[PDB]
Amino acid sequence: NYQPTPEDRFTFGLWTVGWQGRDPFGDATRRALDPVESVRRLAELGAHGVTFHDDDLIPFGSSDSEREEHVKRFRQALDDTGMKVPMATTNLFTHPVFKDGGFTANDRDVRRYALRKTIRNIDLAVELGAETYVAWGGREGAESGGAKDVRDALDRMKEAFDLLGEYVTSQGYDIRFAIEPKPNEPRGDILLPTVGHALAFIERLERPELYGVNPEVGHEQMAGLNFPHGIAQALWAGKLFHIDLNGQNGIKYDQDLRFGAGDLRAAFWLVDLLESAGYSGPRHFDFKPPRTEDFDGVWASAAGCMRNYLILKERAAAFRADPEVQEALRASRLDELARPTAADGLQALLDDRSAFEEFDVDAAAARGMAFERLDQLAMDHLLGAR
Amino acid sequence: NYQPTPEDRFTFGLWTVGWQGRDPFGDATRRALDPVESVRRLAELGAHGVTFHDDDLIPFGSSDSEREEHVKRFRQALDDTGMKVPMATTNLFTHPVFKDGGFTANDRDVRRYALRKTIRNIDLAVELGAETYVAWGGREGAESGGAKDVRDALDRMKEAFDLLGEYVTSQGYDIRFAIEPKPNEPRGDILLPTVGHALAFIERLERPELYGVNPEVGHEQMAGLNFPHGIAQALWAGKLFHIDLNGQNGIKYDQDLRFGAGDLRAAFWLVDLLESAGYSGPRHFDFKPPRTEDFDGVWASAAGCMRNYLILKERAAAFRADPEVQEALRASRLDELARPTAADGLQALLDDRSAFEEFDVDAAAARGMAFERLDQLAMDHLLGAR
Amino acid sequence: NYQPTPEDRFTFGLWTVGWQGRDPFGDATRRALDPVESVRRLAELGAHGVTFHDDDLIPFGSSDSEREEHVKRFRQALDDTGMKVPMATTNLFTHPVFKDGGFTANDRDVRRYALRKTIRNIDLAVELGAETYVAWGGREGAESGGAKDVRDALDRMKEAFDLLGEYVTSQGYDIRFAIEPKPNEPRGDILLPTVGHALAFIERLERPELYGVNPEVGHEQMAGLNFPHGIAQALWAGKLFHIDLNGQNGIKYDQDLRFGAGDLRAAFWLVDLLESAGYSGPRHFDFKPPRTEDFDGVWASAAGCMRNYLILKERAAAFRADPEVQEALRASRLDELARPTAADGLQALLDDRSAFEEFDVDAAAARGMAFERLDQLAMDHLLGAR
Amino acid sequence: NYQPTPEDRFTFGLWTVGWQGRDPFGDATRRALDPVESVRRLAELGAHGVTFHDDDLIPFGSSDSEREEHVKRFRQALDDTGMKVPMATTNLFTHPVFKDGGFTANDRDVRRYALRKTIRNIDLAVELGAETYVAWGGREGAESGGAKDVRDALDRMKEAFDLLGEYVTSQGYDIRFAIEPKPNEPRGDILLPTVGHALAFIERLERPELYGVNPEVGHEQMAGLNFPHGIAQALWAGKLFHIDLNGQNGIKYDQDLRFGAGDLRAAFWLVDLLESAGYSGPRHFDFKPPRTEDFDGVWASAAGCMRNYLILKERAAAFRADPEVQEALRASRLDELARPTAADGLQALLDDRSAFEEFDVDAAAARGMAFERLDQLAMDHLLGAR
Ligand SMILES: OC[C@H]1O[C@H](O)[C@H](O)[C@@H](O)[C@@H]1O
Ligand SMILES: OC[C@H]1O[C@H](O)[C@H](O)[C@@H](O)[C@@H]1O
Ligand SMILES: OC[C@H]1O[C@H](O)[C@H](O)[C@@H](O)[C@@H]1O
Ligand SMILES: OC[C@H]1O[C@H](O)[C@H](O)[C@@H](O)[C@@H]1O
Ligand SMILES: [Mg+2]
Ligand SMILES: [Mg+2]
Ligand SMILES: [Mg+2]
Ligand SMILES: [Mg+2]
Ligand SMILES: [Mg+2]
Ligand SMILES: [Mg+2]
Ligand SMILES: [Mg+2]
Ligand SMILES: [Mg+2]
Ligand SMILES: [Mg+2]
Ligand SMILES: [Mg+2]
Ligand SMILES: [Mg+2]
Ligand SMILES: [Mg+2]
């Protein structure tokens, strides 16, 4: 009954189940988790692996010797459990020095510090076996219009990612970068606020093939956008390197609910797309167990993330395999959408009187698309009424 | 007192002052305007030129002879008034045949028809002197998840724009294309919903240099995004070919208020950016005089668009020229944001102990950014309290 | 398999399945339906009854003799089919005379006309057997701040509803009024924009017992609000006289999708609440079959409204009847929420040292609420995984 | 030049200028302020008074003797400076015991504790001279649908406010209560989420005359609502007891920007309304100086709150006093909106053939409202272009 195994490639950030529940209006409701106990507990639930920020694993300000001890204990738990570390990232947002950003801070010395802090953790990530290095520029942005010249900030952002790409290529590392967009919070507006803006920015980097996106369900929904559409565009561009799964109820603060909560139909269409397209990266949950919960609730919430993915996977597979749905997809001309408009070429199209001079515009207009019957078949499959 | 002249390059769509006031819940409140009278009235107000959809100028279904008469009358009014036509576009959204899209309709014959309808109007646009051809894919999208495979739809969208680029290059035309994003309305979600998604898509076309964006104030605000930030990214990429100016009060239906209404501070920062960056294209108003208004109100509303641009231009210029603001920009380190993070290069950065090992993180963190004083100087300038 | 019968009390507006598909950007895609054929088709699908605006049934401008013929034909179809008319309403929004409102138009003569048009249809409604008369003030509002003094407008709104209440009481009619809120569209902001504002306004009418609310799923969601919470508050006040069921994907234009589309979890919690609370009014669908659809799609969409209600009803009933859920509700202390905080009274509470001086705040804080396990049981029931 | 004096009645919460800058993603950037130094600094800037939560003034867990010392020092600074304390409130949101609410927590013992904590601070408030006691139920709400039965929660909320009203009347205190709505954050949905819902709830309390609202600019804007419209409805009901002034850029997390930032036109129409209606309560700023700022920025930000109010007051007064605006208001029939629709009564309206049978609907429909000219006069006044 919907039991995960490590082959499902479910992964969790240390900061997810370890969130202590401090929010803008309230103190922590849970004690801190040791990363070693999170790894053990997640392995028991069926997870494949964990991810981390540098500062989740090594307390900020640690001496090089305390650092080695923290890494050794962590590596021992990975060996003991079989858990992998597919992705890592840098905390460029918690310490007050990053209050105006890391890569795009107005102060040049902070930007240099931000790059050195990142590069140190790239070495550690490679050593732990990570394939993807995520950058979430949560402090890159502004509350007021005069504080940030955005063209200069984008030059600084391009400069930072170009330098990181020079670093990994000169070291020979097999790691790729993924930019995680978010439209706002904690800054009033964040630079590269959606999947689209991040994809466009990547095309201006010196080595675009090293960079992709790490979209998050709740972040695109904070702009009211359709998250499966945005993932489709990332897949179309070949840039979906990693994904953050969670839930969000509309346009408000980033809730980071467990996956399947929030917009359930969008979760169904997301799973349908990822499975149909053969996405083979980690299914990573970036979620926060609500601060109402004790530790039993934390693990129930994490298990629910995986359960809901596996239920939706089953329902989406049943939908696509149902002959009556295959019939309806042809009734709605999804087959014709996949065929070229004009494989015959421009001159043939210009000479084709059936495309214009003799096109019967009223007969074409009268054809129904039959989309409502198709969508009700999808609803019936989701709810298990088929 | 803030009087426009044709050198300000203000332009209006025929469909703006000609909107009859039909909305989803109500009949028209104004009679139809003859395009010739709109051209004459706009020239009297100080406009530089007009834009059109094919179907605004030539009623749909016109014979080739009625078509020539419509164009001759229009050209005569342009000659009489001195008005230019800098941009044109195609109506691929009103006729029922486009109910599921034009370039990405599921029916292949509609997609071919959509391309032939576009190509016919490109010839007319070039003949009238337009430099920019806009595409707004208002029907390209979906209300439900199974109706549109977005990767196939993006293939069809790329196919259509590639064919249009082949057409203009084979004819030798000096015209460029601008894609106008919108996140929703009239479809539940529209493909390429923001500036960012459109910029990313352009990079996958065969001839990307022929394509840019035509962002609209109200459209990016329907996603809650910061419109001057999005324009900055378009300028940074070199792709701001045209712009649609209007106002919008937040995340709701597309209001198309006169420019300066809606988010007034964002309008100030937009004007500051366009003028500082030297944008030299048309200042185009895509707005709808509210249906409460009679014809005197229509022309008052159009005049207000231009007036508010010129007031904001004056206030933004006074802001940037004020020595006390120049001082505050340096106090907030805008000068340092414009300098390279690491012109000394990667190896120098890695060896620079002042960037990490000896960086005083607490002293850097204590420095205030002084952004609130800067923003209050900007408020004082906007309100004329300086 | 989820077949409606007239005992389920499903009702539809004539304007729903009869929507021709004209939107702000496009012409009609469907021909007009005769009201008599809509009644017959809805009866075949299992509906209980229909609702109407005056102008849906009697074309605007009809002579008193054409009016009688329209009503006779309609009454004959009701007799032939067994369909009831539980609710009626007035169109105070389509005709250009209502461009600035009906009850709160600035022009006094329009406000008087609006009241006479309403009163004429109240007589017809009573004659057809309606129990509820709905008022949706779609044009009452403003696009700009100086156009409407809202305190004077609320005086005029109170004046109009007080007069309508005087009319029904002086005639002896057994009909009640329900105000339908909406936050925006077609006006930039609409007066009484949410359930809450409407409930508060009712308390200032001369005869508050005659007035309740008719909330619409999609309208409260256009403000980002939780629609089952708002219905709970209306039930708590005793004012849920009628309800409009449909679906909406977030904060954007009013989509009026079929019920069950949009926010599916909110639809589940809404059905759970209506059924638990014993709401016994009509389950009315105010939805628009998308303009992609032909007539077969219209009836498929209407049938889907009813199907999804009946599936969600079954899942919510299974959820509430499941012993494991009953256990979890007690684990989360829903039983204690229903008990009085201080039935012992104020003085006892002030003397109770266990409520403050000796209250163990750290032990109470450590108790988890177990809400995530409860919510995953609800997800499992919704998806049929229990 | 726009200098505040204590007669302007500007007040600030201790928690505003004292916010240390801890947000969900980052540590504090500023040290804690002693309340005595905040009082002195605010008095120098021209403030009238301060407000507090119990826990801002008396650290949580203080002994009754430490409590007296904290109050004595505070009272000494009030005496030294002339500052008043017009409002106070209770912190029922920071401590983990309130993680599921205070008055509507599912655990009965927490609800009792919440009431005793409130009652203790009401005594202190009265002793310091406060006239208004605010309740913001920031934790009253839910992230999931099954966690809170909202009808039972509203019973508990009514029970708590009824008990507080019994307490103040039995003690003879001259203090009134004001409920502060907020739609979300930190709970996924908060009960009584808008001005309207709070006004409706007040009408079901045992002693409604003791309760009003304390609306906050940014909170109603987090639902996309028109804040001056909501204030107008509160004034119309006689319930605007207090107000929280700040700025917010659209639907997102609660930004609490300084007043005048965010939606500047809405701030102008708000000031116009408060001054026209003669609101005579405190002009209270509930804002957070951004965490980019040091202490000089904090005081600059607080001063900006007051400056922008006084500039907008001057511009709104000039607008209303301008003969050309008075002419335009009559052109738009604002005078007619203020006159009764039917002072002649129901029977006269029914007999008045000029209201229906002989009403010329086409002539009334053709009259323009002239709202765009009126709104451009308001824009010109705001920008100082008149
Ligand atoms: O950068 C990795 C993670 O960092 C932060 O915790 C963000 O809130 C989360 O969205 C992101 O994925
Ligand atoms: O395509 C040009 C214009 O077409 C339509 O009228 C749109 O509503 C407008 O946004 C667009 O700019
Ligand atoms: O007034 C009854 C109906 O009228 C209009 O058609 C509205 O769009 C709908 O929401 C409302 O319920
Ligand atoms: O309750 C008084 C204050 O408490 C909290 O600090 C809230 O965030 C603020 O909105 C409210 O006004
Ligand atoms: Mg998130
Ligand atoms: Mg996130
Ligand atoms: Mg994330
Ligand atoms: Mg628009
Ligand atoms: Mg537009
Ligand atoms: Mg446009
Ligand atoms: Mg609706
Ligand atoms: Mg509706
Ligand atoms: Mg409705
Ligand atoms: Mg706030
Ligand atoms: Mg607040
Ligand atoms: Mg507040």
Cβ contacts from A onto D, under 8 A: 102
Instruction: Kindly list the protein residues that place their beta carbon closer than 5 angstroms to ligand 7, a single-atom ion.
Output: A 216, 244, 286
Q: Are strands B283-285 and B244-245 parallel, antiparallel or unpaired?
A: parallel
Give dist(CA A16, CA A41) in Å, integer.
13
- For ligand 2, is residue B180 a contact (CB within 6 Å)? yes
Tell me, what DSSP letter sits at residue A174? -
Residue range of the domain that includes C364 = 1-386
Q: Which residues of C touch D97 (CB under 8 A)?
A: 361-362, 364-365
Residues found in chain A: 386
State the first-to-last Cα distance of chain D, in angstroms, to the nearest integer. Answer: 18
Resolution limit, Å: 1.7
Closest residue, chain A, to D136 (C-alpha): A25
Q: How was this structure determined?
A: X-ray
Residue D89: left if φ>0, alpha if ψ -120 to 50, beta else—which one? beta
Give dist(CA D212, CA D230) in Å, integer.
13
Cα torsion D313, D317, D320, D324: sign: negative
Q: Which amino acid is at B335?
A: D
Cα torsion C194, C198, C200, C201: sign: positive
Give dist(CA B25, CA C184) in Å, integer.
12
Angle, alpha carbons C245-C246-C252 (nearest 5°): 130
Q: Residue A270: in which H helix or E strand, if any?
A: helix A264-276
Give dist(CA D4, CA D10) in Å, integer.
8
Q: If 0-12 CB within 10 Å is exposed, 13-18 middle and 19+ buried, where does residue D72 land?
A: exposed
Say if the Cβ atoms of B106 and A359 lie within 8 Å.
no
Give dist(CA C335, CA D193) in Å, integer.
24
Give dist(CA B342, CA B348) in Å, integer.
8
Q: Which amino acid is at C280?
A: S
- For ligand 4, is residue D15 a contact (CB within 6 Å)? yes
Q: Which residues of C touch D194 (CB under 8 A)?
A: 194, 196-197, 223, 225
- Residue A216 labeled ligand binder: yes
Q: Is B384 helix (H, G, I), strand (E, B) or coil?
A: coil
- What CA–CA distances, in Å, run from D7 to A175, D48, D144, D309? 64, 7, 47, 14
Ligand 2 atom closest to Cα of residue B256: 10
Which of D20, D22, D25 is best to mutate for the A interface (most A CBs within 10 A)?
D25
Write out the two tokens for C84.
């009831």
CB D212 within 8 A of CB D281: no
- For ligand 1, is residue A272 a contact (CB within 6 Å)? no
Tell me, what DSSP letter sits at residue C7? G
Cα torsion B187, B97, B246, B249: sign: negative
Ligand 9: centre distance to CA B216 (Å):
6
User: Residue B118: which of B104, B131, B134 has the closest Cα?
Assistant: B134
Beta bridge partners of D285: D12, D245
CB A289 within 8 A of CB A303: no
CB D145 within 8 A of CB C228: yes
Q: Whose CA is nearest to atom 1 of ligand 2?
A: B136
Which of C205, C211, C236 is best to mutate for the D interface (most D CBs within 10 A)?
C236
Q: Which residues of A touch C367 (CB under 8 A)?
A: 294
- For ligand 1, is residue A308 a contact (CB within 6 Å)? no
Q: Residue B377: in which H helix or E strand, if any?
A: helix B371-383
**Considering only CB atoms, which residues of chain B are within 8 Å of chain C?**
21-29, 93-96, 98-100, 138-139, 143-144, 147, 184-186, 188-189, 222, 249, 251-255, 257, 261, 290-292
Respond yes or no on whether the N-terminal peptide bond of residue C215 is cis (omega within 30° of 0).
Answer: no
Ligand 5: centre distance to CA A216 (Å):
7
- Residue A180 labeled ligand binder: yes
Q: Which residues of D touch B385 (CB under 8 A)?
A: 1-2, 311, 384
Say if the Cβ atoms of A368 and C296 lie within 8 Å.
yes
Write out the two tokens for D329.
């208001």
Q: Among the options B48, B53, B242, B284, which is catalytic?
A: B53
Please give, rounded to a whole number of angstroms, the shortest distance from the CA of D367 to a CA of chain B: 7
Q: Where are the beta strands (DSSP E) in C198-357?
A: 211-213, 244-245, 283-285
Angle between helices B323-331 and B371-383 (to 10 degrees): 160
SS (H, E, C) chain D: CCCCCHHHCEEEEHHHHCCCCCECCECCCCCCCCHHHHHHHHHHHCCCEEEEEHHHHCCCCCCHHHHHHHHHHHHHHHHHHCCEEEEEECCCCCCHHHCCCCCCCCCHHHHHHHHHHHHHHHHHHHHHCCCEEEECCCCCEECCCCCCCHHHHHHHHHHHHHHHHHHHHHHCCCCEEEECCCCCCCCCEECCCCHHHHHHHHCCCCCHHHEEECCEHHHHHCCCCCHHHHHHHHHHHCCECCCEECECCCCCCCCCECECECCHHHHHHHHHHHHHCCCCCCEEECCCCCCCCCHHHHHHHHHHHHHHHHHHHHHHHHHHHCHHHHHHHHHCCHHHHCCCCCCCCHHHHHHCHHHCCCCCHHHHHHCCCCHHHHHHHHHHHHHCCC
CB C15 within 8 A of CB C289: no
Give dist(CA A66, CA A74) in Å, integer.
13
Angle, alpha carbons D236-D238-D239 (nearest 5°): 110
Facing residue for B375 by CB, picked from A146, A167, A233: A146
Q: Among the options D55, D56, D263, D272, which is catalytic?
A: D56
Respond yes or no on whether the N-terminal peptide bond of residue D86 is cis (omega within 30° of 0).
Answer: no
CB B327 within 8 A of CB B373: no
Q: Which amino acid is at C306?
A: M
- What CA–CA distances, in Å, run from B45 to A371, B7, B31, B267, C115? 47, 13, 21, 22, 41
What DSSP letter does each residue of B280-338 carry, written as one string?
A: -S-EEE-----TT--HHHHHHHHHHHHHHHHHHHHHHHHHHH-HHHHHHHHHTTHHHHT
Ligand 13: centre distance to CA C284 (Å):
9
- Residue D180 labeled ligand binder: yes
Ligand 6: centre distance to CA A218 (Å):
7
Q: Residue A375: in which H helix or E strand, if any?
A: helix A371-383
Other C-beta atoms lying within 10 Å of the C-beta of residue A243: 24
Q: Residue B122: in which H helix or E strand, if any?
A: helix B108-128
User: Residue D355: which of C165, C163, C150 has the closest Cα?
Assistant: C163
Strand order in the sheet with C283-285: C211-213, C176-179, C132-135, C84-89, C49-53, C10-13, C283-285, C244-245
Angle, alpha carbons B5-B9-B14 (nearest 5°): 100
Give dist(CA C269, CA A264) in Å, integer.
13
Tell me, what DSSP letter sits at residue B359? -
The CATH number of the domain holding residue D363 is: 3.20.20.150
CB A381 within 8 A of CB A318: yes
Please give, rounded to a whole number of angstroms, the shortest distance from the CA of B185 to a CA of chain C: 7
Cβ contacts from B onto C, under 8 A: 102
B170 φ, ψ (degrees, to nearest 5): -70, -30
- For ligand 3, is residue C216 a contact (CB within 6 Å)? yes
Other C-beta atoms lying within 10 Å of the C-beta of residue B240: 23
If one counts the domains in chain C, the total is 1
**Considering only CB atoms, which residues of chain A are within 8 Å of chain D?**
21-29, 93-96, 98-100, 138-139, 143-144, 147, 184-186, 188-189, 222, 249, 251-255, 257, 261, 290-292
Respond yes or no on whether the N-terminal peptide bond of residue C35 is cis (omega within 30° of 0).
Answer: no
Q: Which amino acid is at D49?
A: G
Beta bridge partners of B133: B88, B177
Q: Among the options A48, A54, A55, A56, which is catalytic?
A: A56
Which ligand has the minimum distance to the alpha carbon of residue C24? 2
Cα torsion A262, A268, A269, A271: sign: positive
CB A169 within 8 A of CB A121: no
Cα torsion D208, D213, D219, D220: sign: positive
A53 is catalytic: yes
CB C263 within 8 A of CB C248: yes
Q: Are strands D283-285 and D211-213 parallel, antiparallel or unpaired?
A: unpaired
